Structure formats: C-alpha cells, structure tokens
Design a protein around this ligand. Sequence first.
Ligand SMILES: OC[C@@H]1[C@@H](O)[C@H](O)[C@@H](O)CN1CCCCCCCCc1ccco1
Length: 763
Amino acid sequence: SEIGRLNNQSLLWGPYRPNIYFGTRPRIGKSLMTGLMWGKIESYTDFQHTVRYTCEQNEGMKGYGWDEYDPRRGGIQSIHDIQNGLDITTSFVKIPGGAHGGSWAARIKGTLNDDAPKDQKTIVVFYVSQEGENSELEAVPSENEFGYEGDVILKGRSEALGNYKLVVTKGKGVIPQSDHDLSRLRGPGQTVVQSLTYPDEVLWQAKPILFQQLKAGIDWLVENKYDVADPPPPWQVYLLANKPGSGNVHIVQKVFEGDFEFDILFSSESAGKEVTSKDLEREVKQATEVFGERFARVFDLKAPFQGDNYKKFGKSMFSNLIGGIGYFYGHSLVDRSYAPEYDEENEGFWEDAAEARARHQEALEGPYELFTSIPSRPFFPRGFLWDEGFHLLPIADWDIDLALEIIKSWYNLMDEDGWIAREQILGAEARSKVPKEFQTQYPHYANPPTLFLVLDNFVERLRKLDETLSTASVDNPEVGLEYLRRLYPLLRRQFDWFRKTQAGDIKSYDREAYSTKEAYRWRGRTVSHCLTSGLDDYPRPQPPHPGELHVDLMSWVGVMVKSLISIGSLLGATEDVEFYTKVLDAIEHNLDDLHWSEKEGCYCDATIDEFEEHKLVCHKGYISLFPFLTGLLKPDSPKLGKLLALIGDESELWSPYGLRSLSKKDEFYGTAENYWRSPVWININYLAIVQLYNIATQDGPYKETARDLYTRLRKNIVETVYRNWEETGFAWEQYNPETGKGQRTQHFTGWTSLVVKIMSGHH
Ligand SMILES: OC[C@@H]1[C@@H](O)[C@H](O)[C@@H](O)CN1CCCCCCCCc1ccco1
C-alpha cells in the first residue's frame, strides 16, 4: 500500500492531454487543466485560420513530437509550424513535494524560422480551466490600468489539489505597441487576462470560448465607432480587453514581435517554497541527464544499430510512444440492449445485427477514467485495447511500475460480464474527434488480449526515488505478487468472457477433433471486414458464416491460458491451473485438427460449406502464421519449419522491407482498401522477430534457419522505419512492401515504436 501511494503521488501531474499540442491535467476527472494556443496574425481575418490548439497533420505542420520524455519527470517537445513560421519548444518538469502530487513548470519558447517575416506578430494564449463544485480560482489584478507589465498570478483552491498558485511569467520578447486611439481605452499593448465562468461541462471547448471573447471585443469596436476609415492594427483588434477576476476559466493572452519565451509555474502550496524560473531550468537540465543515463541502460542498441544516428532514432521513437500517455475522463457510448441479433447465430447475421444497431438503443454510461498511451496524437488520441498490448512492451522496459499502472487502469474498466470496450472514447472532448456513427461500443466485440504479453514479460522479470519507483514492483516480490493476486480474478474473468462470447460451433456440423470445446469465432464481422480481430480487411471465409472458425482468435486464447498457468502457479490456484492445463492441451490439438492445412502448409481459418461440411479457407499472410506468432508451437514442430519456409519465401510474404500482411500469391493481394492485404505492419513483424529469436537461441532443427531470418528481418524492419524517419520525420502506420515508403497515417506511435525494442534486443 506504501508503494501504491508513492506511484499515485508520482504520476499525478503530467502533460496528459496528448490530443492537443501542449497542455496539462492531473489524473483527476474534474480538476485543473491547462492548454496552449498560438497563431501568427497578418490580417483582420487570418488568426481564426492560423491559431493552433488540437493536434492535426497537414502541409502546414512539418512535424512535432517529444524529444525526451518520462511521465515521472517531464520532457521537451519540439513543434515545427510552417504555417506560422515558428519553431517552438515546450519543456515540462515536475517538482515532487507536498501532499498533492507535487508541482511542475513549463517553458514555451518560440523562434521564427528563416522564412517568417522578422517582424511577425504572434498571438499566444494560455488557457486555464477548473471543474468542481467547491473549487475556486482567482486572477490577482495588476497595478497598471489595462493589463500586466509583469507576471500573471492565479490563486486557486480545491479538495483534490489543496491550495496552489499558477504563474504565467512576463516573458522575454518584443511586445508590439499601438499608437492608435484605442490605446487610450485598451492600452498600447500588454499581457491581458479574462476571467470567465461557464457550466463545467463546456470548459474543454477552449477554441469556441476564446473566439466568443474575441468576437465580443470586435463587436465592441464596431459599437464604438472604430471602422475602416482608420482601423487599429489586427493584433490590437484581437487583443482582449483586460478583465481579471474569479471564474472557472482564465484566458491569459500575450502578443509578441519576433522570437519569444515565457514560463508557467505551478506551485503546490502544500509543498515547500514556491517554484521559480531558475528552478525550472535546473530541473529541465537534470531530467535530461537522467533520461540520457536510463536510455543507454534500458535501450542499449545492439549491432548494427550502435551508432548515434540510430540512438537519436530510438530516442525519438521512444519519447513519442511514451509521450502519448494521456488521462481521459467521462461517459462512453455503449449499446446495452444485448439484442439477440448480436448472437450472430444465423446465415446472413450481418443484416440482423445491422437491424439491431438501427434500433439505436445505445446511451452514455460511466463516468469512466483511463490512463493510457495512444496510437495517434493527430487522428485517434485514445486508448485501443490490443494496441496498448504493444505500446507497453517498450514502456515496461523503461518503467514496469508505470506499465502496471496502465494495465490496472485498463482492467478497472472491465464490466461484470468480463468485457472491456476495445476503443475508449471518454467524455465530450474525446467524442469531438469522432463521428457519432462510430462512437458506440458493443459488449460482444473482443480485441486481441495483447495486454497479457506485457504480464508475461513482468512474470519472467519477477522470477529472475524516481529510480526506486520505476522498478519497485519487481524489486519487492511481495508487492509484485500482491498486484497479480488482485489482477488475477479479472484476467480469469476476461478469459471466461472470451469462451462465453467468442465461441465457435464444433458440435453442430460434421466436425471431428480432439476437443469438443475449443473453437472460436470473432463476433462483429461484416461482408468485407472483421474489425475486432485487429486486422480490418484481411480476407476471411466468404460469405461470413456462424460456422466460421478463426485461427488467430484460438491462438489468442492460447496466449491467455499460458499466462493464467504462469500467474495461477505463482498464486497457487491449483484447482485453476489444472483446468488451464487441459485447455492448453486441447487448443494445441485443436489448432492442428481444425486449422492445419497439409495441402497449403499453414494454418487457415475455416467455415462450413454449401453441403454443410467444414472447409479450410487459406489466405497466406499474417493470419496463417498465428500459432507461431503467439509462441504456441514446439521448437521442433514439423509445422513450425513449414511456416519458416513461408515466412522466408520472397514470392509470398518476405519483402526487402518486412513481412507482407498478405501473400503476393493470394488473390486478395493489394485489393480494395488494401489495409491488411499487402502492407508491412510493425506490430505483427515484432511478434515474428521475437518468435524467430526464441527458436534461434535454442537447441533444435531450425536454430540456424531461425537465426538467419531473425538477423535479416530485424535488419529490414529497423532500416525501413529508420529511413522513413530520416526522410520524413515520422513514424508511419504501415510500410509499403514494394517501395518501402511509409503510408497511411503519420505520427503512429503507436506500435511502430516497437522498433526501439527490436534494435536493443537481448529478448
Ligand atoms: O490503431 C488503432 C487501430 C488498430 O487497433 C487496428 O489494428 C488497426 O487495424 C486500425 N487502427 C487504427 C484505427 C483508426 C480508428 C478510426 C478513426 C480514424 C479516422 C481516420 C481514418 C483515416 C485517417 O483518420
């Protein structure tokens, strides 16, 4: 309980709003949040198009991301904005102390790029909001008439945070001055604050709230005879009238000519002395040193990636992955009808289930909270179930206590039946990034249980103060077991939930096999898709059919039983461990009996035919290697070796750039949206690389073959991601097997980042 409270205290504050360029919030649903906004202003209508706040990716932004980050300490973020001619640094640092989760500081630095006019006007805004019934926040008024010559001090109080002061410093930088008649009523130009109150649930809507104030300002100009005959400068037209006070929103605005910097100092009163700029500098410096030392220890790049170029690459892939960590809070949209159509028991079941959806029974439920890393800051800044399985493997290396926090956070969402929604859209803010048609979660929709992989890694570590806290759950085996003891019931619940809801039909067709129980079929499939599997458009038996069996799903169950055995063993759940052992046995046999093709030489999904007999439907690709990817095969398996032939074969899956999702020989190669139908995906490649390495480092028939493919596949995967990073600055969602080019979505960190773990090795 001691270590648990120390983690709470340590992880409370962070820049946990990955959906915006820069902002802070604690791991409290209703509390204090900050956000940064900037935009050049050249005209009377331009700011609304230039201003930046939520993350996007267009021709306007060269790139951005974290150059170093640890959620316990802070980090530095770099933003390269073409539209606004600015290179921005956002440095954030945490100062432990008091009872309330410590303090923190940020420095915003903006440098004009060579293209920007030397005399650019740039509007910067710091937006602060506080939710809660019994909380207060006040801007201390200034001496001077029209705004601030110096720092803005906000004093606030809340049950969650105690007393605090949030200071936005005067800054370095030329501040432009107006000789217009308006300066008599608005001042010649200075820092300003507007204190406002709105009903709590709209506070997150910083852009509209801001724009509403600017609009009222411009309206006031027009009411008071300032016109096109003789107008003030644009930048003065968009400077807000100063009106500090109290409210649950505080708009702090500055305008700069040329380069600029300013600081935010959040001072927890319950702590010792208040935070200073000089403080922020020291801690920024200190954090970097610590980051540096830990990176070289945890991510020791092995040949041929020992070079500094690869080190910068790793540091970028790592910092963006871990930097995506967010805290989200609010209601989810869930259909709790449990319509019978979602049982998908009929032929044509996809029209049945569409009819139930068209009943629109869903409603908001919760609130819920989640602490999680995300795949994509610009496009999907939210938790995806099987994604997090992958995100946490490098994170777990860095800070196992951290990863366990995230696992806990995920498992806390599980409902009474055993279900966790595979996509976590929590609260109005999260919903703003998502069409309503795609918000609704479905209690019958699974997602690969990849979080079990991280537990598997923790379990091997457990067998064999920011320093202490990162590893406290492995260094103190009592602590480690107590975690598993508490988690175990939930793991088991989820296992049962898969077998209850994702069951395949053996007994009701002409199907002979060693076990009558073991067969699985992903609920949720449409004619062309099966989103729940993770592999959107990978070809599946056509037409979809309740007699389908999916070899990937079965292998995922295998992944879970094996973990339940390890974790059960460790807690001594003897009754349980024996159930597992009979299940793992049956899956082993059943994988072969239901999914093995001796003709094709790989594992296939199955359906039942027109004549009601079990057919194999083989599509040589990731799906076909699943038992191997998930480590279910014995190292001397004849089948394994046949699969090694497939993996290595250039005319099938082996591209210079990684394993192709689908074989070049399959009819569905590069068809339709071509999502999982040729491209190279780093997450599944990572599984292939890990499993090759296992075979390569053991006595057995395939040792040297596995070793060769490990060597080359590692090389191809790392190089492809790195060349693309070098050329484009980005991690990509997937990679083109013909050109090697990164495609689909940028800023995918995201499981692409597994590249730092591939390079560093000693699995
Ligand atoms: O990383 C999560 C998820 C993985 O779990 C799956 O394995 C993967 O197959 C698909 N990805 C991405 C899902 C994208 C969410 C849909 C809203 C995005 C809107 C858009 C579409 C184009 C650009 O923006």
